[model samples]
Target: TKAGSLTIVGTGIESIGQMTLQALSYIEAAAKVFYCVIDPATEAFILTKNKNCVDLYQYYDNGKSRLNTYTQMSELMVREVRKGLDVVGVFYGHPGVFVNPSHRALAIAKSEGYRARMLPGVSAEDCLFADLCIDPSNPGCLTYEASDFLIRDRPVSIHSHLVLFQVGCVGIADFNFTGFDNNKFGVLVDRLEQEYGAEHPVVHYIAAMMPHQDPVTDKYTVAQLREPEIAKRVGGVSTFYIPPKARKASNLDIIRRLELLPAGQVPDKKARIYPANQWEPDVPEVEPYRPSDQAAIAQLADHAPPEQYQPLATSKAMSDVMTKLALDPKALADYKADHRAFAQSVPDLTPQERAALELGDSWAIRCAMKNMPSSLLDAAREGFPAVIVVGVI
Candidate 1:
């Protein structure tokens, strides 16, 4: 297969709601799959889809250096791609966002001319906008990789929305989140306060990880971001959004850009992202699919291919799903029920499949497709089996 290409995809931050269809689609066709997921559920889900699945959990050690692990991960993916199989590697957040391994793999794969590519997936920062109501368009956005932002002298536009990721582990170059050092963020707060001010609001937001877990978004003044609300004893991922200091744009810019009749022509008078879309109900929201999702779903939908090398713009189908979940409680309930029913409807079992899964205990593992034949090899084709020996942490 000409030493097939490498593709890195994202699962989006929400462990449940939205996975970029492109990411899913990539997994469906990939010959070999490798994943670095956060929890057991995601691991199980990925394996269920691809038996070629392999977990990169060994690289994540509590005290060892993560840069070393990241390098190992990239090398592993590169090795797989060199084997002439279409390889898909999955990451938790938008695949390339804050991920060294994915970035390194893409760079290495392309230098070798193997047609490597990456797709956009929902990132934690993506959810922050919806859950926290902070928009990057305010003064234009200033984003930083928390630690680098602190050490470097990047200019800050207090009037613009500022976002900082990896707030839980400021000054962490090793790239491990196993432990949190609260004092790290304290120093971060001090530096940010110098640039913006003590009063500038800083928010720590975690995009919901599972269907059942509530998202975490705690707000505080610039002075308090280091406190318990922003960074804590228990750690995961959190991003900080800084709102604008002052409004500078006038409606005149829109009129000037769009070549409208006149600036401030409307009686209601306020600047909008695009003045034309302001009055329109259902102005389009960017679709959340990361690169992989867009590609996967585009194939499924059979639409004109989605735009490439551009940010993912969610299609009407994906957007409508989000809208229903956001606005109507009954609709959300119905959606959940329907999803659950369909999940339970599939049949599972073949002799070899039964033996491979039973593991000398009751078979808690299952496959969901009803007509999926009961062959061990066929069962393996549908989903990877999650093997848990449960020896020790």
Candidate 2:
């Protein structure tokens, strides 16, 4: 199995700055490089890195299913790999996140016994957590593509945060972007309103295309989100965030047992009070593999949303980087020092927050966050609260 290999890498959410060093090294060393980066700046940067760069954009055209295009793209890369050439495939955002072709190519390449690997990159949701200051560990996080959310009529826990991806592409599967219809998205609004109520606030967010640009954010209720005026904002890049309707009810008895509060302290009702030992877990049933193009692309067909490995959403990406540079404490310190020195606005991470994030442990990060925390992150990393309703007889 010493033949050609496939190395897949994500260009990250931003155009120029987000590419990882390892991703760049793979591109420069590859015998052939195929890229499907949507942004022009990143594509230009890739071309500069490798003289053998091949644009995978030609595989896409109007009137073709995007799934078919991805299949073709996978086949194209597999063909290059079969030719005994060391090939690298580049995609925007995390390659393993929502990318169909990246997964498909790796699956097929390995099925034929070629060495295949994928590297993580900064996804839009990663930037979302930083810009919006949402840590998935707080109140938990669930994600699904917009069309799948509608078609599946997916259940949502009111106590958890919801992230609906691709709200702008609800019904359309073909590659024609000019003919996007918002009516299908309106149906999604109707469905959500039935569960969360029409007045539930939702944020329409799109991460910045370049490092210097600001992310697009618009706040609206579920009713306002469906308005004709806001139709233009829903598209490929859009992600809808719906916060929990209210704070989770606290278990004062549990808090007392854990000794988190002394007798008379009326706890902050909005803050999480349950000590670590009191929480329970929900084990999701992973749906059996059923093969369909829509099922593969949407990834939510006949399934419950699981606890995803959200590195950046939890600052785990930054933590992992800092953990590796443990020997170079000043490198880590200087990085944060630059963050403090820069006049430009940055994510609201304090020196202690950045220092704690350096340890690269979610538990350790949260432990340090005890001194200064998100209004509420999750009580635990996975699962919704147990639906317990206790009332006096």
Candidate 3:
């Protein structure tokens, strides 16, 4: 029963710090390691762990379809398995997240009767959540490959966060050192603008490869995506993050049937409220409440015409503060306690920007710090009123 086996592992976003012990163990024990990773450090680490390492990146060539390259990578791994040697395939980030070769190798190996399995690793989305302070379950989250999301005309919920992966490679099938052209990017921007308004803020994100590096987060309005200067920054490693525009009203009929609201009690139409006791056992307790009837009625007001887009000045110093507020609870708490004090602490902030931050005016803060992520802007709105209705009653 001394047969071959295959194990696929991912190095996570920052390979050195984020790699799992289980994944490392597999690489160390494998008779042969086949790796296709982004950074040289990962390759070097794998080589040190297992001397019999083969770089699958050799399969890639400019103008060659990625599908063909993936096929070759899978074939190479299978070839080693056929030799009755324990083989491991290593990839960057979560091997199963957007990787084709890892899945293909597992399928081919299992079909050939070799024991095969894959291990999970941290994905860029995981990093995004950490770096951007996004809670996917708060409103909910939607993820799609950029090109696939576009070609399929995927249904987007403005009420939920959207993360588009491989935005830099949109409509691209071939591998190239130089980034893909932006001709097709305009088409993507147009489609997104239809769903989320042209003035909707979106983020261009690139997770750091090294432990010491900070992630690249550039914010722009959906219409700004078409600008050549901005579009040029969209490369193979780029991801697009679109924050929810507004929260949707919960079905009052369902709440009534469930008896979560008592007789004569008007529920909050803008917020998704639930009875404190209705939460899962593991969830912490929260006070149950309902908004006033007047408040609920006010939420049903007619939508106004969309505002015209205005160019806002950008500031890196303001962006840094916004990022801190998003990621650091203490920083946000301090700001809430004394906004003027917190605003004054950041000397780099302009007098007008500081005044806006002190007042906690969402619009003023946004206009002053245009490049702040939309999530932070949403926070500034204090769960602002919903503008777009998803479905009819």
Candidate 4:
């Protein structure tokens, strides 16, 4: 039996140019490729690699809740992995950042005993740092979901830079295609006014969605944040950026503890770093396998198949009881009313499998279908969890 595996990769913000070589290789090598990018250019490029590339976006129905849509995507991917094939999931921006379905699918894949992992890519936050010319190392930066920051009364320090994500969808739960009401936006202004003055400067920003295009940004005072016209401009993808309002004096006690500066000498408390490296060399290279000589190494390299390489674009089981449950949660609940009929629906399942479905076995259902009776063998190790700090001092 071919070992089933999964690899999650990101297309970055710009697939035409920003796609990493490692991401591209995975797209080409996988037996099945699934993508959830909004750009047609990206879709076209990926189709060039493998015609079997599946679009997860079709599962999204405007009437369906985002969570429901995501659940459907996860089940579908898990079903594909269960076929004992190498699968690749491509997402826009960093796969692990702000993407719910990508993470859920990878989690299910790994939990089902199939090899699964995510590869980092350029995120909007990464682009924001480059275009906004702000270093997180300085007074430090705080990030939060916009709605949570407001409703939960999240603490904010006026001395540090702040970034609020998903501001356009604040106070919205269901999928709203047209536009969201700006009524709750005033509360966001109210929250910020409590910390920074009403006259504080704020920038409404949207990272460039199209390749070769500059970011769209507008600057205004916090007092104008509640204006219906200004609030309406805030779309689902917009982010709110707030510069630090005040700078703290250098802490003499900490400075003294570090013993870096001489006593009585004032430190630079308002220092800001600019002219940063737009991109860094992040991917590491594996050393060449040296056996006897160059000729032997070259011969072996020529015959060796690419890592996790699987070929063939074929149709397989897609819709199952789990997939049906994803589409209609009420269906599962309805089945709960009559447990025996639901158990007998898939007669091929074992007694344990039937009981798992009857009891709402979230983990067991996946493992049973994939023939992966156990969870992952051990915790997966991550080499690079985050981007390196470029400049501090």
What lDDT would each prediction earn against the true structure? 0.66, 0.73, 0.79, 0.72
Q: Where does candidate 2 have its weakest 10-residue lDDT segment? A: 274-283
Query: What TM-score against the true fold does each predicted structure earn?
Result: 0.64, 0.67, 0.67, 0.68
Per-prediction RMSD in angstroms?
17.9, 17.1, 20.0, 16.3
Q: After superposition, how far is residue 62 of candidate 1 from its true place, in Å?
A: 3.7
| 2 against 3, candidate with superior TM-score | 3
Q: Please, what are the lDDT tens digits per residue for candidate 3 over residues 280-372?
A: 112234434445655666866875533432345758788788877765544866998899889999868888778888898887786675444
Q: What lDDT does candidate 1 reach at residue 250?
A: 48
List of clashing residue pairs for candidate 3: none
Candidate 4 structure quality by residue, lDDT tens digits, 87-202? 88999888888889888988888877887889899887777776777777666789888998988888887777788988887787767556566567887888888888888877
In the range 213-242, model 2's lDDT, one tens digit per residue, is 898877788889767888777877888888
A best-first ranking of the candidates according to their lDDT comes to 3, 2, 4, 1
Candidate 1 residues lying further than 4 Å off, grouped into runs, are 175-178, 226-230, 249-393
Query: On a 0 to 100 scale, what is the lDDT of residue 391 in model 4?
Result: 38
Strongest candidate by lDDT: 3
Indicate the residue-level lDDT of 155 in model 3.
85
lDDT of 4 at 281: 16
